[PDB]
């Protein structure tokens, strides 16, 4: 191929160079893209791989901050925010749109990607606006610890008490934890734990003034759908912002935060409030591909996945041997593979952690804290760790087992490129055999078209 004076950085780089896309080419809906995954059928061609390179070294979230209004324009506390969270110098796009309406008492629905500032989007108006005064519902216990820890840090600056309630915990133990802690202004609880307390009448939501739901799509899972309904009947909800500001008839302000929303959520919201009274805000990057994050795709058989994983681990070891490198996150679909793979890692004399949903709750909590403490730089975890896991220092996210759905990948994808990330994140996914090639085809096709992935509608 002739050497053009100005080549184009590879948008898609594959082991076979003939199909690489260097320059400005967009194919569109009608054109069938010649993807590297187009014909990834006959496993005889070992070691085929393609990687999406990082396009930006500067954080896109920090980019365009000058085009977004200041916190004062949002109605905002700043001195406490500067002391508590100096890192957020300027508001993000989601924060700028979401904060002003919340301070006015308007019910808000926020659809944005992980790490877009959704947590701070409601917390800032929540603090200014403020028998607990605020309730936080979180589906996974892992998220509860982070939310409680994050909320406690903010509370410590403001002298507020925050406690955590993890679902699946025994009724006697749950009561024991409640009695051993002082009264908390804001409570973070999971549907399983919160439902148990409500059934035993350990808490009342009639005096609740604010309810927070994190990961609404996950909270709407059938595992917690019934529990949420039981919570709703005990919770009076404000109908208009005027009632929220009415001292004679105070009611609870509802705020919804999630990355995706199942169809029919409007009907659930309609029976609690008028559809026109719900403020829906969508992030510009919601369901959009991340250019600054490297995504690696490699053809490996189940036998070769262990082979490449050792090679990848050795590559990371070599990188650490030359310059400091970030932690590596390994995602597996099943605990059995984690245990089966974990024994192989133990045979390699490699320090690593094993995390899966069926492990003891007490055991899981300690391991999660240990990883945050930096006890071990290698963590093997299941989808339970794809939600509510801190990955600010994670350099490589390894999906040993291919994620079943795009939504799960997004939660795994959100782990990299977070605010304050010390290292540039990377994503690695493995495909065993012709089981699944459409999912890779869809992801590759979207990148060439620079379009949102199919099926991500919230």
């Amino acid at each position: 191929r002739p050497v053009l004076v100005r080549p184009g950085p590879l948008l898609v780089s594959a082991r076979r160079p003939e199909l690489n896309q260097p320059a400005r080419l967009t194919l569109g809906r009608w054109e069938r893209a010649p993807l590297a995954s187009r014909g990834w059928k006959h496993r005889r061609s070992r070691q085929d791989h393609f990687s999406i390179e990082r396009v930006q070294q500067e954080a896109p979230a920090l980019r365009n901050l000058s085009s977004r209004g200041s916190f004062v324009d949002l109605g905002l506390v700043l001195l406490a925010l500067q002391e508590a969270v100096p890192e957020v110098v300027q508001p993000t796009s989601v924060q700028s749109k979401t904060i002003p309406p919340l301070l006015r008492g308007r019910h808000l629905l926020c659809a944005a990607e992980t790490g877009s500032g959704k947590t701070l989007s409601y917390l800032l108006p929540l603090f200014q606006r403020l028998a607990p005064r605020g309730l936080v519902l979180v589906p996974s216990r892992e998220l509860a610890e982070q939310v409680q820890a994050v909320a406690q840090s903010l509370g410590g600056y403001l002298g507020l008490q925050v406690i955590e309630l993890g679902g699946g915990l025994g009724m006697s133990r749950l009561k024991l934890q409640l009695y051993r802690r002082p009264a908390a202004d804001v409570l973070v609880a999971t549907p399983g734990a919160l439902w148990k307390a409500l059934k035993s009448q350990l808490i009342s939501l009639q005096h609740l003034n604010f309810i927070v739901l994190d990961e609404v799509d996950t909270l709407l899972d059938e595992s917690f759908l019934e529990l949420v309904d039981y919570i709703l009947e005990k919770s009076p909800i404000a109908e208009s912002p005027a009632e929220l500001e009415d001292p004679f008839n105070p009611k609870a302000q509802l705020v919804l935060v999630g990355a995706t929303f199942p169809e029919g959520l409007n009907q659930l919201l309609s029976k609690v409030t008028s559809p026109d009274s719900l403020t829906t805000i969508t992030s510009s990057k919601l369901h959009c591909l991340m250019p600054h994050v490297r995504q690696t795709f490699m053809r490996l058989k189940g036998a070769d996945k262990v082979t490449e994983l050792v090679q990848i681990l050795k590559q990371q070891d070599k990188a650490s041997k030359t310059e400091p490198s970030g932690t590596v996150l390994v995602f597996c679909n099943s605990a059995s593979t984690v245990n089966w793979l974990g024994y192989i890692l133990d045979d390699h004399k490699i320090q690593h952690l094993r995390l899966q949903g069926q492990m003891p709750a007490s055991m899981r909590a300690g391991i999660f804290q240990s990883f945050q403490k930096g006890s071990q730089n290698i963590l093997v975890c299941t989808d339970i760790a794809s939600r509510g896991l801190d990955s600010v220092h994670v350099e490589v996210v390894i999906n040993y087992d291919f994620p079943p759905t795009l939504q799960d990948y997004i939660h795994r994808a959100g782990r990299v490129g977070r605010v304050g990330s010390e290292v540039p994140g990377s994503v690695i996914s493995f495909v065993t055999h012709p089981w699944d090639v459409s999912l890779v085809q869809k992801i590759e096709l979207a990148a060439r078209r620079r379009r949102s992935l199919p099926g991500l509608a919230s």
């Binding site: 036998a303 262990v306 082979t307 050792v310 090679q311 050795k314 192989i344 045979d347 390699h348 004399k349």
Partner: protein, 293 residues
Amino acid sequence: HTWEEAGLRYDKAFPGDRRLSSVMTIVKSRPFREKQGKILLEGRRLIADALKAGAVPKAFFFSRLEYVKELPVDKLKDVSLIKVKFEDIKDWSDLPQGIMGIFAKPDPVKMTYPETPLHHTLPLVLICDNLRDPGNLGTILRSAAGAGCSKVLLTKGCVDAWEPKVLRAGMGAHFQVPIVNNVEWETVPNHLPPDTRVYVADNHKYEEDLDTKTRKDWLPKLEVQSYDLDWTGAPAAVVIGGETHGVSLESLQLAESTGGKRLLIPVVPGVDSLNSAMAASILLFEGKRQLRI
């Protein structure tokens, strides 16, 4: 640089060689290693030891060609001799003086043990009970190797004898005594030679293998014999208390059924159960004396 000389071929490590990648799966994964029936050897001397013993080798990786010439190349017919980076060998091994050797997983029943101990070989079987220490297992095999035991038995839960570290602890002792691994307790009676009496040196963790309802009535009242008395009048089997488990329940029960006793070694406190290498050593050696006399 790949060279062929006098029909002897040794290669040089290639960039991205999938041979090295496949080896890594085989080496550390014993189930895969058993699936491929291979073992890994460390050191020229220990490497040459297997060649002398007639074990079938698989592949050799070495930093210097001198090691191949230093080793007997005549026995290197079945090995692809590869010149590799010195840093790679230490990366491949979890411990390598410039060379590492892959060998076929030997079957000790099929292994050739020449005359010198066979003249001193006894109808004596050594049994390791829940021996979970890789160092002791290899360190143990010296005693079995030097003693001349007809066979060595390792109960289920014991360390893999063919693990390369156990070879380092024994420094080739696996090529000097038959070793049986992952023996089921129900099949242990079949593993004993005819008329063999099973003797258990007793030092307890083995009491945890007892049903709680039947825990207290299930203890065998098996006779205690001083280890200094004659016990080798007929073929005998020796049991070694594990470091973590000690002497197990089934060993005590089997000894009573086999007509044996407790060839009891008074265990000096400070070592709750005599070190399995120490416990193994004493039982074998004077058995040679007892039958020799």
